[PDB]
From a paper:
ACE2 can only recognize “up” RBDs, which are less stable and favor conversion of S to the post-fusion state.
The complex structure revealed that three [name] Fabs bound to a completely closed S trimer with all RBDs at “down” conformation. Since the ligand-free form of the S trimer used in this study mostly shows one “up” RBD and two “down” RBDs, this result suggested that [name] stabilized or induced a closed S-trimer conformation. Further analysis showed that [name] binds to the apex of the closed S trimer and targets the core RBD region. The 16-residue-long hydrophobic complementarity-determining region CDR-H3 (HQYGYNYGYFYYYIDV) inserts into a hydrophobic cavity formed by the RBD residues F338, F342, V367, L368, F374, W436, L441 and the glycan linked to N343 residue. Residues 417, 484 and 501, identified as key mutation sites in recently circulating [name]-[name]-2 variants, are not involved in the interactions with [name]. Therefore, [name]’s binding to N343 glycan might be involved in blocking the opening of RBD and thus completely locking S trimer at the closed state. In summary, it could be concluded that [name] mediates neutralization by locking the [name]-[name]-2 S trimer in a closed state to block the attachment of the receptor, which only recognizes open RBDs.
Numbering used by the authors:
A (entry chain F), B (entry chain D): 1 to 111
C (entry chain G), D (entry chain E): 1 to 120
E (entry chain C), F (entry chain B): 968 to 1015
G (entry chain A): 340 to 475, 486 to 498, 503 to 580
H (entry chain B): 27 to 66, 80 to 95, 99 to 140, 157 to 176, 187 to 245, 261 to 387
Amino acid sequence: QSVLTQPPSVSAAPGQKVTISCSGSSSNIGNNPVSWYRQVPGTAPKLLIYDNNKRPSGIPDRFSGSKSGASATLGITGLQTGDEADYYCGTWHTSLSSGVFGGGTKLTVLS
Amino acid sequence: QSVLTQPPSVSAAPGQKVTISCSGSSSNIGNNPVSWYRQVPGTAPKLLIYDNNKRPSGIPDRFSGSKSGASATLGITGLQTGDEADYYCGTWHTSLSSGVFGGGTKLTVLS
Amino acid sequence: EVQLVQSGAEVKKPGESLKISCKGSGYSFSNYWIGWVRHMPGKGLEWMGIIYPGDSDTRYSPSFQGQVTISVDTSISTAYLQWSSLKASDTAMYYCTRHQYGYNYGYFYYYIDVWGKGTT
Amino acid sequence: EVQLVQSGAEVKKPGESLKISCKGSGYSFSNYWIGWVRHMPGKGLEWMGIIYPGDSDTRYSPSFQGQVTISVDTSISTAYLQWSSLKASDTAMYYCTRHQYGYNYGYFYYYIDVWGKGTT
Amino acid sequence: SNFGAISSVLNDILSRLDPPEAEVQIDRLITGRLQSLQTYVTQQLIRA
Amino acid sequence: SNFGAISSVLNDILSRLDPPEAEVQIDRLITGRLQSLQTYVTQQLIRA
Amino acid sequence: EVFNATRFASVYAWNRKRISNCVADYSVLYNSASFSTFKCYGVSPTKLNDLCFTNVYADSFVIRGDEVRQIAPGQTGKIADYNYKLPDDFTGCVIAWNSNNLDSKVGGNYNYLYRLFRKSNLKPFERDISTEIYQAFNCYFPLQSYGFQVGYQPYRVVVLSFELLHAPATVCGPKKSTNLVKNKCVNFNFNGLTGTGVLTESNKKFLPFQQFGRDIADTTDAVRDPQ
Amino acid sequence: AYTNSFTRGVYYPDKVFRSSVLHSTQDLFLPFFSNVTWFHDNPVLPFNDGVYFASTNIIRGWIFGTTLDSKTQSLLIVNNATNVVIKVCEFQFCNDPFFRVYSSANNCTFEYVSQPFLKNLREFVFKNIDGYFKIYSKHTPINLVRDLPQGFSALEPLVDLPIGINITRFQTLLALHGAAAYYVGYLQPRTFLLKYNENGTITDAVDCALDPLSETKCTLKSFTVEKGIYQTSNFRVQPTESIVRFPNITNLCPFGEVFNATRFASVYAWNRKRISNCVADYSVLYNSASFSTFKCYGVSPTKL
Ligand SMILES: *[C@@H]1O[C@H](CO)[C@@H](O)[C@H](O)[C@H]1NC(C)=O
Ligand SMILES: *[C@@H]1O[C@H](CO)[C@@H](O)[C@H](O)[C@H]1NC(C)=O
Ligand SMILES: *[C@@H]1O[C@H](CO)[C@@H](O)[C@H](O)[C@H]1NC(C)=O
Ligand SMILES: *[C@@H]1O[C@H](CO)[C@@H](O)[C@H](O)[C@H]1NC(C)=O
Ligand SMILES: *[C@@H]1O[C@H](CO)[C@@H](O)[C@H](O)[C@H]1NC(C)=O
Ligand SMILES: *[C@@H]1O[C@H](CO)[C@@H](O)[C@H](O)[C@H]1NC(C)=O
Ligand SMILES: *[C@@H]1O[C@H](CO)[C@@H](O)[C@H](O)[C@H]1NC(C)=O
């Protein structure tokens, strides 16, 4: 559906180590670094993970990332219920000179 | 159906000079040399023609091959009835880093 | 502290044109790229297109080329879009935002903040 | 004289896991690639995936990635596969074989011998 | 004098060049300062 | 002496180099063995 | 064994083996039409058959294609400075051939890797396999992998660096020796020492570890025949 | 327990047979008349580029290495009294050798066996020159036991080993049963004149940097100098320290402005800006792994 491919949703208890992954071509992701954001229902998306495996200031160290080939992985430790959200992956696509997003992933905590 | 394309079958009398040909992309065949095998019904396939136009020891000189661009040709002289079999073309495909086969060709002798 | 503010609640009928506003404050506006991303209800964000305020250079995603012509006013540091004819399925939450698009020495892409709202 | 021998006649029901065996004898086993190719009845051979016995490095065709995890035991020069859940259409004649995959000076692929059997 | 090197002061050619490339310039000085010192010696052996 | 060539024995530089490249090293010997032979001659013409 | 091997070490810690006590047909390498960049420094390839060397080292590793120009005397860059540097004095020959068929992958290989953050870029032929996390525990550690899938074709590189003039000869290409003569001035070739002259039996007391003598000015005056 | 190294430590630096020649060379040698540590319990000792070692049929082989444990590569030369054996296998630390000195033959990498080395005096020079372990030895009749005999002796090589092991510490081995006496001397990069005999045996040598009188013997290329005044070398005062004085400015030069800029002019009319009055950290550009083609002319990047 989207030029990047994402899982629809996941779920795991608080305290588990969750790794979701979103895939796309290598015309973009293989050469251009991957960005991930979080969106709470009713809250505008905020920057979560940037160029690769890196988080801004204010975001706790629990978040991490990893790009492999033409796909990306976003991992979180010490999961808590307020971390329930939607998670998105995005990156400037080189060929179409455009820049795109993943589909969206529904992280729902167990509780 | 297969990433290589093959004829379904052929037939020609004993003593005729038969040339079958199987086609594929140039991501593999144009750069990677073509291998052909023979399989008799109930007999595990054996190596017939390798990297190009070349046969192992024990195989009679009647067999020959030729690769052109993104396709291959397998030719046989002095055809005999015990040469009835299935014939296959294969070669390591570069892009998918995988290696693949043709579809299969039913050589049935006339008799 | 940077802030981008968008116009209030908007609703219109198919057949009409639109020009939504985005204002930036608290940073050198004429040195950062600014562009739009559409998030639909229960649907994911779509990358729309961006422009360089300093020189009115635009990049358009093909999925929106010709659809929306996006321009700027560097006199007051405010960017806007322009349409031709609203479609009924244009009802979504649009977003204006500033994103590093530079080439520090090795190329990098980003998103700093949005805090917007839009609908149709 | 090299020989590869496989397990006997095999039949199982959908819902189960498998680990088929292949044994090599008469050659330096820890210096040749070994891999699997599936021939279906009245159907053509499919290239499955291979592994380097010396260091347990694997190459998987995408049409079988995740399907079958193929491993080795260099202690006794024997290779095997592993599944998750047999499908009813998995009924075919599988084959284990050794094939030159080297880079002599200009690259070459080969197929030396199979003499196997398998079904499900 | 340059004799063709980038600079006539052996320190600078040495200060701002990597050894592999430098000695290619240092060689153009040595080959000159030698020929100019061996010219002086000869004229003295004749003058003496 | 090398005078900068790879080796001071004209046979080896000749033994293990293709003629196009070799003469670039042979030139560094000739240009030296000449200057050292013409130094000897001069000192003799003065000594004689 | 050098070339056909299915495992080339990462350039971070490049492999190296020493070849000795054998006859080395060099033609197999030269006249093969496979090798991409065949470049010989200090030696011409067509003559490798007629030389005798003390030691021959064959260091082998993989690299990104665009960097094959880094493997040469007196070149600089990330690979030529931080990972594997050849001296200004020659390395014999560099052979390299494109190799994305074997060593690339369906995805990023990530096994082959190189350091970008050595602090004190290494001297000729130094194999530094440490990991000290160059400063910004958290600071970036040196080795960063390389991902494969024509400037990013993985290229396999093998470098033959001939160790010339250290000891008696040990590696000599194919050349059918002939019986020796005396007292006729001949274009001789004793173990690589190529000359002319008449050969006479010697009374000069050699020692079992002396190979020849030179009176002065590199005049090889005596020599012990190899056989 | 220092003693004087009168003239010991001279060894054939190659095989190039020479005869009746005062040939000069520059190698690692035992400086003349140096004080040596006369050991007689066996601690660990630094290698320092190479070691002289002389003992007076009791002693056993040696051990060298960086840490003398399976952690890093180690070199072990055992003595069998039947055949000399060498191993680079990474043994464990044996603070007391005893054949109980062999901890474990783990990670065996190199091995070598030959005839054993075996009132008297045996002298050995060890050096690791460029991946090559050279050993030299000789054996001589001697009786003055309290001191190292005066006289001259050359040590022909026994073997080189293509190893390349970083050795920085070492110790003698002895399977136990006030012990015997041996001596230790270090090598230095010293120029030597060497007088080769009529049959090519080194008979005498001069240390070109010991004393003025030897300096003249060296420059004159002879062992005997006639009366006169000879010019040996030139002397200059070595610099006490290095000073640096750069201007006071600290206005760090704007490079991002050059590089990060989103508009590069067309090459038809190329832009140009002048940078001045600032401190320019150049490392940011050099050590960045982004830039594809980097090529300085007339200046080397690492020195900017
Ligand atoms: C240049 O851009 C870099 C990021 O690419 C930024 O860190 C820096 O502040 C910028 N400097 C100027 C003068 O714009
Ligand atoms: C090396 O591989 C070649 C084929 O590429 C083979 O002919 C040869 O026997 C192999 N040699 C060794 C020592 O493995
Ligand atoms: C070389 O070895 C062969 C095999 O023993 C022997 O016949 C021949 O005489 C040897 N050559 C010499 C010069 O001894
Ligand atoms: C010493 O020599 C004896 C007899 O040859 C042998 O059994 C023993 O293994 C040797 N020791 C070593 C360390 O080689
Ligand atoms: C031998 O070397 C390998 C590679 O570092 C290491 O894993 C192993 O532990 C070493 N052997 C011993 C006995 O430590
Ligand atoms: C050699 O060993 C010493 C002592 O451990 C160490 O400090 C030094 O860094 C090592 N150098 C090399 C090149 O191995
Ligand atoms: C070399 O040694 C022998 C024995 O010491 C001696 O007779 C001879 O004089 C020496 N030199 C020669 C070959 O004249």
